[PDB]
Every structure is written in C-alpha cells, then in structure tokens.
C-alpha cells in the first residue's frame, strides 16, 4: 500500500467515526510519529481555523485535497448548509479524501472533484452551480497559484471580499503569486508566518482578499 492508504487506515483505527477533531489528531499523530506527509498540519491549521471563523464562508473552493486533512479542518467549522468544493487531480487521493470525509461525517458538506484546476475552474458556474466564491484555499501545484487566481477572476468567480488563503508561500514557495498579489491594487494581502507541517522549518500562509477590478 501507499503512505496515503496507511494514513487513512490509521485514522479508521485510531479516531472516532463522526468526530472531525479526532480525525485531524490522528492524521497529525501519524505524520509526526510514523511518516511525514504534505497535509497542512496543525500549526498552519490553527491559522486556517482562525480565518475560517472570522469569515464564516458559505462557499469555499479548495485546490488540492490530498488526503482530506484541510477539507476536514475547514468543513468542520462551516455553518449549517455551507459547502466546500475540493479539486483533486490524483484519483487515488480523491478516493482517500472521500473516504476521510465519510469517516469524519462531513460528506454532506463537501464535494470532492477529481480533475485539473485549469479544466474544472471554467466548469464551476454551469456544472456545480456556482455564482461567486467566498473563499479559496490554494494548496495544489505551487506554479499554478498565480495562473489559477487569474483564471478564477476571468471566470467571474471572485467578488469583492473573496478571501484567497494560500499554503506554502515560503516552502516550497510561490514567488510569482506572492509578488503579484502583493503588488496588485486588486488584493489586500496579509502574511501569517508559521512552520512547514510537522517540521521546524519556516513556512507561511498568505491571505489575499480580492477587492474587485
Ligand atoms: O506539492 C505540494 N502540494 C501540491 C500537491 C500536488 O497537487 C496537485 N494538484 C492537486 C489538486 C490539483 C488540481 N489541479 C492541478 C494540480 C492539482 C506540497 C508540497 C510540500 C513540500 C514541502 C517541503 C518538501 F520538502 C516537500 C514537499 C508541502 C505542502 O504543504 C504541499 O502542499
Ligand atoms: Cl491538507
Ligand atoms: Cl504541524
Ligand atoms: Mg500544502
């Protein structure tokens, strides 16, 4: 089996069904004690929680699900009826994420999409009946942060006040995205310094709030 399957089986055998906080704890314990993996992790997760609670978004788009850690983290804080759409290009990871969400009891809040962001973003309005997004969590290929931000805008998916929250802006890094949003009058940007998941390595989140054209 793969690392991702081992993480899912660990959660199934060490967390309580229907209890999202147990699922996050189990993932973080496994990835601290057994095998590192690219989940957002608890240090950066606690900053995500504070952002989610400040904005109480009704409709969130995540780019990059992986094993569903960030999807569990955000969906557990959504208000009743609020929704998360999460895009995952790797079908094995899409299947782990669906199973992780099932286990956590969050499957009615989340729709796990299996494809590439550049293919799926243009289908959001017609196929997933999206008007505009309240928040976007960027956690996919780091060289896609910037092009997908611009594609979201092209597609009319951003509105005044949509919150972009970007993982890994330091490690691995997203230098073009950072320079762009920080330089642009169309974004109001804040950096939250933290640590790479499970490591004593500096990383950070960027929040970039869209201000319209
Ligand atoms: O690579 C990372 N994430 C991206 C996964 C592929 O995403 C592909 N992907 C997922 C949906 C999706 C939709 N469209 C396109 C590609 C799409 C990633 C990497 C590291 C990391 C840090 C230090 C290291 F030494 C090694 C790795 C940390 C992270 O937190 C990450 O998130
Ligand atoms: Cl994650
Ligand atoms: Cl961590
Ligand atoms: Mg990440």
Which CATH number belongs to the domain containing residue 175 in this structure?
Answer: 3.40.50.150
Which residue segment(s) compose the domain that 154 sits in?
1-213
Using CA atoms, how far apart are residues 178 and 170, in angstroms rounded to an integer? Answer: 9
DSSP string, 51-118: HHHHH--SEEEEE--TTSHHHHHHHTTSPTT-EEEEEES-HHHHHHHHHHHHHHT-TTTEEEEES-HH
Q: Is 168 left (phi over 0), alpha (psi -120 to 50) or beta?
A: left
Helix (H) or strand (E) holding 49, with range, is helix 41-55
Pocket of ligand 1 (CB under 6 A): 38, 63-64, 87-89, 116-117, 139-141, 144, 167-168, 171-172, 196-197
| Structure-determination approach | X-ray
Total number of domains in the chain: 1
CA-derived radius of gyration, the chain = 16
């Amino acid at each position: 089996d793969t690392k991702e399957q081992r993480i899912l089986r660990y959660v199934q055998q060490n967390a309580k069904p229907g209890d999202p906080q147990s699922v996050l704890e189990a993932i973080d314990t496994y990835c601290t004690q057994k095998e590192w993996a690219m989940n957002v992790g608890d240090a950066k997760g606690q900053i995500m929680d504070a952002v989610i609670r400040e904005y109480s978004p009704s409709l969130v788009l995540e780019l990059g699900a992986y094993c569903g850690y960030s999807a569990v983290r955000m969906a557990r804080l959504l208000q009743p009826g609020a929704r998360l759409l999460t895009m995952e290009i790797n079908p094995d990871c899409a299947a782990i994420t669906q199973q992780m969400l099932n286990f956590a009891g969050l499957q009615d809040k989340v729709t796990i999409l299996n494809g590439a962001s550049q293919d799926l973003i243009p289908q959001l309005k017609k196929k997933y009946d999206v008007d505009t997004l309240d928040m976007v969590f960027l956690d996919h290929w780091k060289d896609r942060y910037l092009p997908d931000t611009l594609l979201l805008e092209k597609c009319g998916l951003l509105r005044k006040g949509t919150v972009l929250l970007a993982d890994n802006v330091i490690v691995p890094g997203t230098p073009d995205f950072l320079a762009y949003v920080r330089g642009s009058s169309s974004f109001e940007c804040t950096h939250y310094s933290s640590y790479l998941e499970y490591m004593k390595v500096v990383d950070g989140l960027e929040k970039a709030i869209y201000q319209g054209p």
